[PDB]
Design a protein around this ligand. Sequence first.
Ligand SMILES: *[C@@H]1O[C@H](CO)[C@@H](O)[C@H](O)[C@H]1NC(C)=O
Ligand SMILES: SCc1ccccc1I
Ligand SMILES: [Ca+2]
Length: 434
Amino acid sequence: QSACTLQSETHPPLTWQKCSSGGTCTQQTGSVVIDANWRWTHATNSSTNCYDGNTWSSTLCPDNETCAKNCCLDGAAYASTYGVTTSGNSLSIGFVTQSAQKNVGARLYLMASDTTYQEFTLLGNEFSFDVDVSQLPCGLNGALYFVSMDADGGVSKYPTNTAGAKYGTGYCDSQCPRDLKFINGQANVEGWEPSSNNANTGIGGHGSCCSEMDIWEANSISEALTPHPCTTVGQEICEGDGCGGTYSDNRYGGTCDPDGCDWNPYRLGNTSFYGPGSSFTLDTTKKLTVVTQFETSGAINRYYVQNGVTFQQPNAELGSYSGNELNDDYCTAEEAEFGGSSFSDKGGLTQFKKATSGGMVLVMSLWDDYYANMLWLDSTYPTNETSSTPGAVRGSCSTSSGVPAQVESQSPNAKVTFSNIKFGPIGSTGNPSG
Ligand SMILES: *[C@@H]1O[C@H](CO)[C@@H](O)[C@H](O)[C@H]1NC(C)=O
Ligand SMILES: SCc1ccccc1I
Ligand SMILES: [Ca+2]
């Protein structure tokens, strides 16, 4: 896709800190950009939409190539249309924003410059951020994660994509998403199936895969940490059911692991650690710091800070595993006790190390789930399961919670605030900010 300028594009600024082993941190200035899927897509020479509702213009977009030649992405009014605002080192994403249209959520990337994404090499480093999940009820997910996207949004590889990172192009993840309108410089109009439950989305014939590190998928009820390997580390297009993931016939048939080796404290047995109120170790009605360390062995460590008190990830006992570190033994025990072989089949933490050793882009989002109502995160899933089934219970939300239309109308003012992002060598982010 190309870019149009009927509406200007001004990325909201966001500062973050880069720390060093020597004990000092320094302020960095970046900005955020909204994903292409949320943008107005119209003809290069007029205001005629190439996509409206959940259908493509058959005249402007008869096929993927023609569509990309005829159509451009335009600028975004961040606050008024998308409910995205920034203030210093703070970023807020509103749930439902009503302007001339209704907008639900947003997926944003941290930029290095106006035309390129900031890449972070995670291995041997740690990432820290503060978060306020108090306004996120059952059914919502304020996520902060990393994906192996190209810095230019794919421009150097796909010439027909001239919009680039500036317009939020090039997204990919371990779900190998097929809801993307533009992938590899072409539209995704071929094979498009409008969603039966979502008036604004659909599934195309192609998807975009890559490694994904979900540092934080959470609401005020539950939270999960989840690495997802892929046999091809970086962004790669997939076709139809060969994509795997949620909207394909064989979920485990693709190149990526859509499940991951997840760590949810509640799912592992500690139902008193994270939740709303004083009866929980970490009280989700108040702000908290989340620190994630990527050691060179490939293992992942985690500690939290609230009101100056530090809490290491709580201990879990799962089969032959005992500890609080997300490592090979944990991932193997998880598969043995809860089932599955996807994570291991994709290479486990060894293959995932190839992703963290390379550059990854920071993504911050707020979404509701039209497929499984976020039950996999904060409720019993599948819903026919009991608490007696290992790993079935992931949170205290009702299995009737999370219906998108219901939460959109009941909690439109829900929001997540991510702030004070710090990144540096292990043991460095707790030092004084610059
Ligand atoms: C949950 O984790 C916290 C923090 O480690 C700990 O103090 C508490 O004893 C744990 N509770 C259970 C039931 O394991
Ligand atoms: S990653 C959560 C999950 C796991 C297995 C099947 C479907 C779903 I959504
Ligand atoms: Ca270790």
